PDB file of C-alpha atoms in Angstrom:
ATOM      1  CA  UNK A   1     -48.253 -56.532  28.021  1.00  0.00           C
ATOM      2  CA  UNK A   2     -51.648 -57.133  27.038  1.00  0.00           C
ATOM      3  CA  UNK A   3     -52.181 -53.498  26.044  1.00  0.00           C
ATOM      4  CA  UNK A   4     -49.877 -50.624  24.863  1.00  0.00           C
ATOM      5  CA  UNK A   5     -50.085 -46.930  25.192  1.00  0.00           C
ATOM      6  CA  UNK A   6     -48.878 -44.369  22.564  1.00  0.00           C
ATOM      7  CA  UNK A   7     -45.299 -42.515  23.679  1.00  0.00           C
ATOM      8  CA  UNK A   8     -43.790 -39.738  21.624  1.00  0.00           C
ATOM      9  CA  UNK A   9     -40.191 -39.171  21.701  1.00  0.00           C
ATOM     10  CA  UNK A  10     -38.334 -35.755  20.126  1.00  0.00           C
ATOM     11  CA  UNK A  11     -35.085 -36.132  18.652  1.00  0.00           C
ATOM     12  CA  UNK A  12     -34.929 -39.179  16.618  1.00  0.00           C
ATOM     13  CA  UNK A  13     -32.221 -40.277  13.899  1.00  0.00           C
ATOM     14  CA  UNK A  14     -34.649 -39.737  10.770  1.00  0.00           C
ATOM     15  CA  UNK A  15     -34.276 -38.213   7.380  1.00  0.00           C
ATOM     16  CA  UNK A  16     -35.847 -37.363   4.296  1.00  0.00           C
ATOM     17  CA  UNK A  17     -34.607 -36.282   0.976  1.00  0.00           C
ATOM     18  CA  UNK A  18     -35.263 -32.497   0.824  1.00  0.00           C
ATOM     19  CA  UNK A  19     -33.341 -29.066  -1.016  1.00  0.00           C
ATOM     20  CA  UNK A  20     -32.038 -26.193   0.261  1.00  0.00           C
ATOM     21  CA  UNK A  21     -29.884 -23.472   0.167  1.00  0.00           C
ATOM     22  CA  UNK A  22     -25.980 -24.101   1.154  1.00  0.00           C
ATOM     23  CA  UNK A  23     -23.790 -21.244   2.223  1.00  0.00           C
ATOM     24  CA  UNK A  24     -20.025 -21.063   1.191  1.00  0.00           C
ATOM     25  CA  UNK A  25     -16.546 -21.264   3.680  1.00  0.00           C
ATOM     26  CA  UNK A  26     -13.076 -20.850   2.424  1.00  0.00           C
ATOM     27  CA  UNK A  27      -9.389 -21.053   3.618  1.00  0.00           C
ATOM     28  CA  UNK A  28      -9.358 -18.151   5.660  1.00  0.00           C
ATOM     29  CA  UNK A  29      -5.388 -17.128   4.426  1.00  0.00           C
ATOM     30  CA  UNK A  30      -6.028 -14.118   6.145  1.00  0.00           C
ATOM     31  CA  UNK A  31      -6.995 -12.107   2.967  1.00  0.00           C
ATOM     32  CA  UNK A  32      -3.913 -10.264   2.964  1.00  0.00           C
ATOM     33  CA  UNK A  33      -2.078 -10.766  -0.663  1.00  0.00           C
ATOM     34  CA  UNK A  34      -4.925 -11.656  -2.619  1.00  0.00           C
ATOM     35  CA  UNK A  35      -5.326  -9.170  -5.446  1.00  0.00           C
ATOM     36  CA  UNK A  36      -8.374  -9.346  -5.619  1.00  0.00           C
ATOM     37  CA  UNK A  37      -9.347 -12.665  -7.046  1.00  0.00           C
ATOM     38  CA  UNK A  38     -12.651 -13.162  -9.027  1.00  0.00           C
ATOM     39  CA  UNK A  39     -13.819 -15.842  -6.426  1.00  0.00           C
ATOM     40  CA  UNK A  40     -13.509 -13.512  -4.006  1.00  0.00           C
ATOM     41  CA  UNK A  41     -13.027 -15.225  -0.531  1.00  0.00           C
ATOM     42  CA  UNK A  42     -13.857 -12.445   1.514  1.00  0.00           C
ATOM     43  CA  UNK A  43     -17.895 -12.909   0.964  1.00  0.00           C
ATOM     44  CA  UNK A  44     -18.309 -15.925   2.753  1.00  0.00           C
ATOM     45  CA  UNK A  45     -17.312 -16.863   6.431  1.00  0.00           C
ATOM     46  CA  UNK A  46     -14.019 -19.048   6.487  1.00  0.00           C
ATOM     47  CA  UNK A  47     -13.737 -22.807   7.406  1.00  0.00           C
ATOM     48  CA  UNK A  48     -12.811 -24.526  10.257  1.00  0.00           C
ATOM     49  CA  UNK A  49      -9.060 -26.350  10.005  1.00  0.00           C
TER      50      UNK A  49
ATOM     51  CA  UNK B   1       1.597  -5.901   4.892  1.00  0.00           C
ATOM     52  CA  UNK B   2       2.932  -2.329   3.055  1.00  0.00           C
ATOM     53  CA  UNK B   3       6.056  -2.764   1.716  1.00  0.00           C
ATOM     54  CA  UNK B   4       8.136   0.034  -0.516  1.00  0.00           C
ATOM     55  CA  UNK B   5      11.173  -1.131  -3.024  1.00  0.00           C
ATOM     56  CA  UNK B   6      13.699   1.812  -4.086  1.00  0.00           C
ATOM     57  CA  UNK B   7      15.576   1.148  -7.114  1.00  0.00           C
ATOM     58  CA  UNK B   8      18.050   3.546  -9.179  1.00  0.00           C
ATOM     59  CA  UNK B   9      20.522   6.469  -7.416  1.00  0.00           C
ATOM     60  CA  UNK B  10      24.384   6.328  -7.672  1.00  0.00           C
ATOM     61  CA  UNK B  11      26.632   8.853  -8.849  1.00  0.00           C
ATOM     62  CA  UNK B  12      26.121  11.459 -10.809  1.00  0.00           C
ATOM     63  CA  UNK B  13      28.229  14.587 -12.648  1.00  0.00           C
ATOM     64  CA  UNK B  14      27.208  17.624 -11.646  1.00  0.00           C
ATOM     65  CA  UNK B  15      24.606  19.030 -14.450  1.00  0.00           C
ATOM     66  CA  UNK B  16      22.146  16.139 -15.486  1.00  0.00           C
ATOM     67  CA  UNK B  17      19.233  13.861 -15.155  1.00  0.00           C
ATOM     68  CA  UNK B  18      18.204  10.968 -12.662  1.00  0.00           C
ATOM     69  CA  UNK B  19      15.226   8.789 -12.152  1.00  0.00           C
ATOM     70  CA  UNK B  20      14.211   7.063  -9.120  1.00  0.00           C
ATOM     71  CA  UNK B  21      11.763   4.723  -8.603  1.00  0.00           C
ATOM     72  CA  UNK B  22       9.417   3.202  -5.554  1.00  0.00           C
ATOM     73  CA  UNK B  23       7.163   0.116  -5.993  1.00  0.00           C
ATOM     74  CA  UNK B  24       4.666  -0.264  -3.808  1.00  0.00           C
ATOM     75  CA  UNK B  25       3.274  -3.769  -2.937  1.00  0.00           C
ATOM     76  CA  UNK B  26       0.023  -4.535  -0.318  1.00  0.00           C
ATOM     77  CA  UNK B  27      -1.538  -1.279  -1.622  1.00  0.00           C
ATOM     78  CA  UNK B  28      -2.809   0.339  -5.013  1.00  0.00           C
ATOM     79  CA  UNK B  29      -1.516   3.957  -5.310  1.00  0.00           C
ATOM     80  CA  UNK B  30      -4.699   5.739  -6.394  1.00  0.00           C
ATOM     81  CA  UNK B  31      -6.443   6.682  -2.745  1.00  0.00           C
ATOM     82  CA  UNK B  32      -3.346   7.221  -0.686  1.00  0.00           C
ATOM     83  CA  UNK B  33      -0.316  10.036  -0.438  1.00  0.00           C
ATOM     84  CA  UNK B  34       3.363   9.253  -1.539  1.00  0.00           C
ATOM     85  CA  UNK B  35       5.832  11.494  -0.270  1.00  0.00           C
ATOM     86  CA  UNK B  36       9.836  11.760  -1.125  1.00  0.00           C
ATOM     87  CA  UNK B  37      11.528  12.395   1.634  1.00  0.00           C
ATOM     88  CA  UNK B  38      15.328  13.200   1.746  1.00  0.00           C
ATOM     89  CA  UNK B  39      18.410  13.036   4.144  1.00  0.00           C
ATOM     90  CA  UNK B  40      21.525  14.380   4.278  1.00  0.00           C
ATOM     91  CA  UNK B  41      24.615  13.364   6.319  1.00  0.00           C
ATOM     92  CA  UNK B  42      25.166  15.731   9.569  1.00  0.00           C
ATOM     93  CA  UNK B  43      21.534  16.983   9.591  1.00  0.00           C
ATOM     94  CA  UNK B  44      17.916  15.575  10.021  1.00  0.00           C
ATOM     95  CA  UNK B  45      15.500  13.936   7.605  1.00  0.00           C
ATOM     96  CA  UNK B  46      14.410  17.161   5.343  1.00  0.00           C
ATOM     97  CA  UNK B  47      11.751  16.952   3.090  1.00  0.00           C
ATOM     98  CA  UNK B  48      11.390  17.018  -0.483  1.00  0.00           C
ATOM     99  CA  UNK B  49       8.176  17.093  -2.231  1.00  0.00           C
ATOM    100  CA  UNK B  50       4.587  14.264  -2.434  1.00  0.00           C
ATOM    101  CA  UNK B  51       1.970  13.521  -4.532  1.00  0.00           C
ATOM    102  CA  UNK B  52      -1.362  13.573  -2.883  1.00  0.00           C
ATOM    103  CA  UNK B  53      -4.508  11.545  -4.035  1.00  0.00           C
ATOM    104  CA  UNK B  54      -6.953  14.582  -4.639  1.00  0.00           C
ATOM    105  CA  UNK B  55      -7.297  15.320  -7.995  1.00  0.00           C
ATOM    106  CA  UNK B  56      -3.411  13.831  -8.707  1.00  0.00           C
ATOM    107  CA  UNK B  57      -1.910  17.245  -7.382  1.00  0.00           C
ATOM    108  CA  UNK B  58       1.347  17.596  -6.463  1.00  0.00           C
ATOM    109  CA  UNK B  59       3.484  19.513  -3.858  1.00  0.00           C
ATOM    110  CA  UNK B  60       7.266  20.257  -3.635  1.00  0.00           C
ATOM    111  CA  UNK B  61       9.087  22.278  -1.056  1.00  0.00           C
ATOM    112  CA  UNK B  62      10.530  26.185  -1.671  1.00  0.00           C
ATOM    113  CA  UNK B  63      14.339  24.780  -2.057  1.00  0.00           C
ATOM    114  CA  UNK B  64      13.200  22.516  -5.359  1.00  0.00           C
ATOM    115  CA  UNK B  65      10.884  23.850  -7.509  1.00  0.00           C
ATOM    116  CA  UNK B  66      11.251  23.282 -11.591  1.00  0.00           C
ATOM    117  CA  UNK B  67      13.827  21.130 -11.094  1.00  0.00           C
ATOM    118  CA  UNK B  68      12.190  17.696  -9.756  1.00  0.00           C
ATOM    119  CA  UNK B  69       9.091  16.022 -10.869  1.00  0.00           C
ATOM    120  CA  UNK B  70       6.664  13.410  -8.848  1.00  0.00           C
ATOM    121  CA  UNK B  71       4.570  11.316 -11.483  1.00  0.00           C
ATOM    122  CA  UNK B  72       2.656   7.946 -10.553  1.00  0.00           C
ATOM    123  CA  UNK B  73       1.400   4.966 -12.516  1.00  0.00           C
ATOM    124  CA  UNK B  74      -1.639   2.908 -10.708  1.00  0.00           C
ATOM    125  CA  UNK B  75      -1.805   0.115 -13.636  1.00  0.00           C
ATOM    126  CA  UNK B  76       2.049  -0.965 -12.986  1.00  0.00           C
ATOM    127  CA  UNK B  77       1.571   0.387  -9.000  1.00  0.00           C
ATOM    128  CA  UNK B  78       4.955   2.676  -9.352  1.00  0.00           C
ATOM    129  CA  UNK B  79       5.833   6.003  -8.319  1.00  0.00           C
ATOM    130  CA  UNK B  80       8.457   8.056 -10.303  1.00  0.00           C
ATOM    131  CA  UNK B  81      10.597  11.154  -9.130  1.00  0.00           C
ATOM    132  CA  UNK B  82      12.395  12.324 -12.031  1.00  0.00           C
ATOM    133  CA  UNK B  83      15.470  15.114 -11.080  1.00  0.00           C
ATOM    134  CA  UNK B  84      16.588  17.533 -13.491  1.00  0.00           C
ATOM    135  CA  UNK B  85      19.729  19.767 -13.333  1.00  0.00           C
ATOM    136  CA  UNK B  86      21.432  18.467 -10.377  1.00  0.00           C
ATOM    137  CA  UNK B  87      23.198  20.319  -7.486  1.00  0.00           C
ATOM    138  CA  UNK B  88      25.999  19.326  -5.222  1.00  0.00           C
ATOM    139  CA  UNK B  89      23.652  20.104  -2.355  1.00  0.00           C
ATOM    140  CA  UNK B  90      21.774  17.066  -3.183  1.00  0.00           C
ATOM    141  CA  UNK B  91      23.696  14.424  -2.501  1.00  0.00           C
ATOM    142  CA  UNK B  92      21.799  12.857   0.295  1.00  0.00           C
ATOM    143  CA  UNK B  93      19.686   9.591   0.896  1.00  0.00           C
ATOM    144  CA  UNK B  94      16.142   9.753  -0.602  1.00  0.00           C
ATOM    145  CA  UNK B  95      12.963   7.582   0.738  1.00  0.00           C
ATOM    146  CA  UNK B  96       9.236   7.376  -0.198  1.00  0.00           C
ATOM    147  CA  UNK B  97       7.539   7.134   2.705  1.00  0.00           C
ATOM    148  CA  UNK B  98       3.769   6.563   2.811  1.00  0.00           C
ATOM    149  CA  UNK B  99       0.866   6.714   5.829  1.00  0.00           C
ATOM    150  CA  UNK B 100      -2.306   5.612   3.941  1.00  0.00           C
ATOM    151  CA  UNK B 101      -3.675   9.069   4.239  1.00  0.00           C
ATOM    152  CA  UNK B 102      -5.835  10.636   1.348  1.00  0.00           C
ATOM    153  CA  UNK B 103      -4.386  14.153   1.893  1.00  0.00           C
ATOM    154  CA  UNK B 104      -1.031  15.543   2.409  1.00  0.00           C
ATOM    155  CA  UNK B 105       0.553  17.935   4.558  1.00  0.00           C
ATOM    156  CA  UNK B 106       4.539  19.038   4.077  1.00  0.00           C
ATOM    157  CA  UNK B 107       5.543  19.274   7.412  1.00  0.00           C
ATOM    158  CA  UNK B 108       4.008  15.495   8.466  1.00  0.00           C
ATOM    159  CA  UNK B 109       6.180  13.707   5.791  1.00  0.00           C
ATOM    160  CA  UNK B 110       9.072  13.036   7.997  1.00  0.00           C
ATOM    161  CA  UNK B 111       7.313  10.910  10.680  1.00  0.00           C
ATOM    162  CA  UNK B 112       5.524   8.389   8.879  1.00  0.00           C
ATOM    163  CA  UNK B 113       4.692   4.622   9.760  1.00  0.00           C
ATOM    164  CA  UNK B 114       6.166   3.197   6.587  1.00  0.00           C
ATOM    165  CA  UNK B 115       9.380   3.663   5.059  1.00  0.00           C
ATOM    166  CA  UNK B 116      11.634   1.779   2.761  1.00  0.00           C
ATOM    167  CA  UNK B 117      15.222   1.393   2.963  1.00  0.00           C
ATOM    168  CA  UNK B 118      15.779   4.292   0.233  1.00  0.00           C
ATOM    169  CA  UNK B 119      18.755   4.629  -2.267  1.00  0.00           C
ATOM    170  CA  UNK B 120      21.985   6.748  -2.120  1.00  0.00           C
ATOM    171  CA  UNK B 121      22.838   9.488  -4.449  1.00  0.00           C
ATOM    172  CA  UNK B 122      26.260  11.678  -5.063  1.00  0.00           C
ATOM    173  CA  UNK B 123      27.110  14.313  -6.986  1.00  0.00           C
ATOM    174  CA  UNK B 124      30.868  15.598  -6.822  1.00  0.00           C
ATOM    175  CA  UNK B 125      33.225  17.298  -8.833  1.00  0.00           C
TER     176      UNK B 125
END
């Protein structure tokens, strides 16, 4: 009460604005009759449905 | 998936010129065989001639030789096999058969994975 003591706690919900380097994920479509788009889908892991 | 289209055949006077053709979808015909295969009723699938990938060579069997020609096109993805001076012993049902194999051999041409339906040709009278 009269006194408090420091506590640390890991894991907190706290954010700061920051940049860094995202990473692709397309429809899978199983890369099958694509001939051979531009975009090519098969250089980045596919997505979740 | 590899899937082969036949198109052209019929009938045919004896003494003339016919032109099938084979388009090949799910693969580009530059790095694999394409063979012709051909068979005849009463008897097993024979064998008539393929076009390997090395070098664009081509190979045809002892019975036809001057007489048929294998040619492919990789920009339209189509394989040609142009007969000249027809016989009544070819009138038989022809296939192009494939096995994604850079290299062929003309006694493996019969048993092969893939195969089209194939077209029908006569010659008579």
């Amino acid at each position: 009460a009269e006194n408090l003591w420091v506590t640390v706690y890991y894991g907190v919900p706290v954010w700061k604005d920051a940049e860094t380097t995202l990473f692709c994920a397309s429809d899978a479509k199983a890369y099958e009759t694509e001939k051979h788009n531009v975009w090519a889908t098969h250089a980045c892991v596919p997505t979740d449905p | 998936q590899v899937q082969l289209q036949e198109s052209g055949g019929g009938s045919v006077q004896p003494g003339g010129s016919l032109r099938l053709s084979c388009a090949v979808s799910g693969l580009d015909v530059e790095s694999v065989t394409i063979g012709w295969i051909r068979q005849a009723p009463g008897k097993e699938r024979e064998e008539v001639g393929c076009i390997s990938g090395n070098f664009d060579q081509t190979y045809y069997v002892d019975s036809v030789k001057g007489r048929f020609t294998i040619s492919r096109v990789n920009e339209e993805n189509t394989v040609y096999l142009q007969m000249d001076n027809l016989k009544p012993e070819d009138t038989a049902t022809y296939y192009c058969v494939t096995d994604r194999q850079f290299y062929c051999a003309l006694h493996r041409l019969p048993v092969s994975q893939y195969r089209g339906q194939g077209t029908q040709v006569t010659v008579s009278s």
